């Protein structure tokens, strides 16, 4: 009876965020992790406290290797295996790091950004769509792609990725009724390494409010996205910025 | 209660918006320009739901020397029945062709007046008159692949665009936010006949679905919400994938 | 026989400098002024002590009004008379000035703003399509639309809707075999009245070269886009910014 | 005094029109090819009866694996070894074919990131590590964003291909290297496709419902590497007849 949702990266910040939301929906959960076990545990602890047999979590390393593929199929099998369904599948997952052009291997760097952000959400996507109600995908995409950090390369071509993706898989996957959306960040939660003054220069660019969006607020686009006030929505991408792509240099 | 503006508002997509910010709460000042019944009908029914809630406003939003008075004029009269006006809806518009190959002029005021200017302007006096504030506008999610001999609507479109974007950023600071939906087919033209409207809806790949005027209501009631208090400057395409498909 | 081009705002600046290398190129040219007759003047004289008979001017406001029809109708009629023939229109004619939502009359400023930008472009278009080798027509638009100065809303709506009228324009005039264009600079040649200050805040911004593009700079894409080798190429907006747009705030 | 040129792809159809464009401009080319080895060396020899020792060729699967970055540099170096200077990378390569999401996906992966936008990164990073008028042109696709069903990974490489043509454009840009798009819709069309297929095509383009030739490609990417485009970067060029333009 209740849906079921699988959120990738869940542990903490956006993703958690988002599990969290969709858990007070209605949704169970597979809140997938890589690193961060302590959390992701807690997370699905805190959540059968309120729901019993609503949460379960899946460890697995999104970067591209021939066996993502099979990690992939196994988060997704993961969902069906805990709740017998997935209605709902939110690639959140995502490294972030510079990759200057002129100066980890970069066979590593390419594995890992283009992989967490853009094949293993292709992947997840086949996985989802291939084991099939109002059932969709939503992506989380950059409000700043095309307006990219400088060194950034690789991380906005995976990012770039998503967004070809979202399209290309709204427009194949609709005669399955699988809708698939995205939710295009600027700033949220910043980095947990970045200093007070770095942080403080980001808030003062955004136009409505100074400040970074929380993740709830993030959320709550996602959770429109798969809602039943959504249902004619495919293949859009909603910027949660503030403004903030709106602003010349 | 909070207060909205809806242009456009006696029938179809304006009325669908009209009733459900009337349903999630709001005071509604439904905008004709010649559905005057219509609109009186609307106010009729959402004054038995609660009373006083619902007023009419005639206005005609073609460009001309006094669209600025009646633009200000449609801002007021939510003032004046409620006391405040959260909510700017610009949704009036008209849609027919001006090939390059009704006067020029006359069709720029109607096309132009009605798509662009005439959100301006409202704009400009929601603004000066200024909690959850915001305007969402109406816009075209095939405004980059236009409808053939369509030149001044596709620029009244784009120039909706512009001024989502150029609002959105310099009323964030008033907490204004600024949004648009852009739907693809909705509710086809009545003029419309069949065979051509069933040629469009077999093109829109989620279009098992049918094309509804409260899908639309439904992302404009979104962006109006607590739910979307830091998007400005967004549009959100309601289209079914249509404007994914290639020719 | 030569072919012959109108630019509107020929007499000084962008409009200009595109004039002079359509000159070069071999083309006659109508110079469209407003106010600037002294310059225009100027200019033709100029080009027909080059070439004979190569050069006339055009006098007329674009400020949308219940005459701008017949006024644009005639700066085309002006390129046949002179010259038999009107192969290229070069839409540069431009006023600039803020709009602010927050506080000429605003129908004055909509007329202005609107007009000039985009509704004598579209009755210039209009005129010459009707009125109709290697036709096409070239608008100026501008890289920085989505990321618009503040206090310039009309300014940015009249871009936008040039836009619009690009791509409508080249849908609907491809099957007469006119191609139409634009090219979008970010900043060029800066406005006469900004202090070097100003203008050295704006030269800063830009990745390539930290300065403004040269007035030859812009035409020499208008002139790539009028010329043979870009008989394909319709609907597209060439950016001729230096990287400007791609910088985040 | 000669400028240089690599072109990814060269044997054949655009990457050929574009290596001959860019000859009969001054440059030496080197024609980079994977598989046919025939054609490129015949494409050599021609260029080199017109001017001596103007041409070499250099091959190289652009797949992705392990060992591509070493494979990029390589080609990269071909053209320092060859002309001592590299001027201009046109990254043309390309791997086309379906993907439905209902050769192993890894496989599929590889080729078709790999081609359209790992290889053009990596040779990106060669480039500009190595270094009048430097750029690079990647060819792109005006569809992009009305892709083909069922086409998701080539897609991806695509749109992937824009953000390196953007973010290259803003990381390379102080060192004078422009770097640019040109954006194809329909052009030379599959040796396979049969005409009444190669017709439906030709029939949706606006602009004279015919494809482009590669001649007509290869035009914008000689503007962009011109003198007449110095100002030009991070800006992709659409030569499509209007095709993206036209809804379905
Ligand atoms: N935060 C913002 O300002 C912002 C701006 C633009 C876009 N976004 C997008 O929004 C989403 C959430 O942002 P966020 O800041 O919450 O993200 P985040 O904290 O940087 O990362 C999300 C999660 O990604 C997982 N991850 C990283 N590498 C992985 C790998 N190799 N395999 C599997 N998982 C891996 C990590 O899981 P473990 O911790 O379990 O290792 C991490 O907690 C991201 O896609 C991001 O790109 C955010
Ligand atoms: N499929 C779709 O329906 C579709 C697709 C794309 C975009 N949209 C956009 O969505 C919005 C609503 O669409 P819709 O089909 O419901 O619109 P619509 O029925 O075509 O028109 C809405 C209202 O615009 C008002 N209007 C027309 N000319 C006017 C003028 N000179 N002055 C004042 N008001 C005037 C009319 O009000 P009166 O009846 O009172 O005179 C009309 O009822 C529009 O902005 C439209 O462009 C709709
Ligand atoms: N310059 C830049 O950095 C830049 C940046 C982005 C876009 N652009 C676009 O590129 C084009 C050229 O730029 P620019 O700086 O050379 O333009 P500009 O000097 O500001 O203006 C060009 C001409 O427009 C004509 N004009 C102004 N108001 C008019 C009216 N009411 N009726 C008829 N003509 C009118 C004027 O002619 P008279 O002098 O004869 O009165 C003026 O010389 C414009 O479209 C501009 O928007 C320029
Ligand atoms: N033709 C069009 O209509 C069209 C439309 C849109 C975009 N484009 C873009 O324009 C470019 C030129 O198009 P085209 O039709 O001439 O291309 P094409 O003939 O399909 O392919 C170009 C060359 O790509 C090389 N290539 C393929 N897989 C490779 C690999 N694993 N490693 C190294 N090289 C590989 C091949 O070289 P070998 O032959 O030596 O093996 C092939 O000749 C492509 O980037 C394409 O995506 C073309
Ligand atoms: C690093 C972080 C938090 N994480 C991911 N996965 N993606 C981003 N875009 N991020 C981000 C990076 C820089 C800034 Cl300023 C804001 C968010
Ligand atoms: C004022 C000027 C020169 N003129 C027009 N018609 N359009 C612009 N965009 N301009 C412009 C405005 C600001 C800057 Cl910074 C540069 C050029
Ligand atoms: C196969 C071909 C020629 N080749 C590449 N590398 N990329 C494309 N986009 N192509 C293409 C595919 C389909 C069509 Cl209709 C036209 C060109």
Redesign the interface.
């Known amino acids: 009876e209740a849906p079921a949702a699988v959120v990738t990266g869940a542990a903490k910040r956006i993703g958690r965020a988002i599990a969290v939301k969709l858990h007070q929906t209605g949704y169970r959960v597979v809140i997938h992790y890589h690193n961060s076990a302590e959390a992701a545990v807690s997370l699905a602890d805190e959540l059968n406290k309120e729901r019993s047999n609503t949460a379960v979590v899946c460890q697995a390393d999104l970067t591209?290797?021939?066996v993502?593929?099979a990690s992939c199929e196994e988060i997704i099998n993961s969902c069906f295996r805990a709740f017998g369904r997935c209605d709902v599948l939110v690639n959140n997952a995502s490294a972030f790091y510079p990759t200057?052009?002129?100066?980890k291997?970069?066979?590593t760097q390419?594995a890992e950004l283009?992989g967490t952000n853009?094949?293993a959400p292709?992947?997840l996507?086949?996985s989802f769509?291939?084991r099939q109600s109002n059932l969709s995908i939503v992506n989380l995409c950059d409000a700043?792609?095309?307006?990219?950090?400088?060194?950034?390369?690789?991380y906005?071509?995976?990012?770039?990725?998503?967004?070809?993706?979202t399209?290309?898989?709204?427009?194949?996957?609709?005669?399955?009724?699988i809708?698939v959306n995205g939710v295009a960040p600027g700033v949220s939660l910043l980095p947990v390494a970045m200093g007070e003054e770095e942080k403080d220069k980001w808030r003062r660019?955004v136009?409505?409010?100074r400040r970074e969006?929380?993740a709830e607020?993030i959320a709550?686009?996602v959770?429109?996205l798969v809602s039943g006030?959504?249902?004619?929505?495919?293949?859009?991408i909603?910027?949660?910025?503030?403004?903030?792509?709106?602003?010349?240099?």
């Open positions: 591209n290797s021939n993502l593929p200057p052009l002129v100066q291997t970069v066979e390419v283009i853009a094949i292709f992947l996507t086949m769509a291939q700043m792609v095309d307006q990219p950090c400088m060194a950034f390369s690789l906005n071509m995976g990012k770039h990725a998503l967004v070809g993706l399209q290309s898989a709204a427009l194949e996957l609709a005669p399955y009724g809708r660019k136009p409505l409010g969006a929380s607020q709550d686009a959770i429109f006030s959504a249902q004619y929505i495919t293949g859009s909603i910027k949660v910025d503030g403004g903030l792509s709106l602003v010349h240099a």
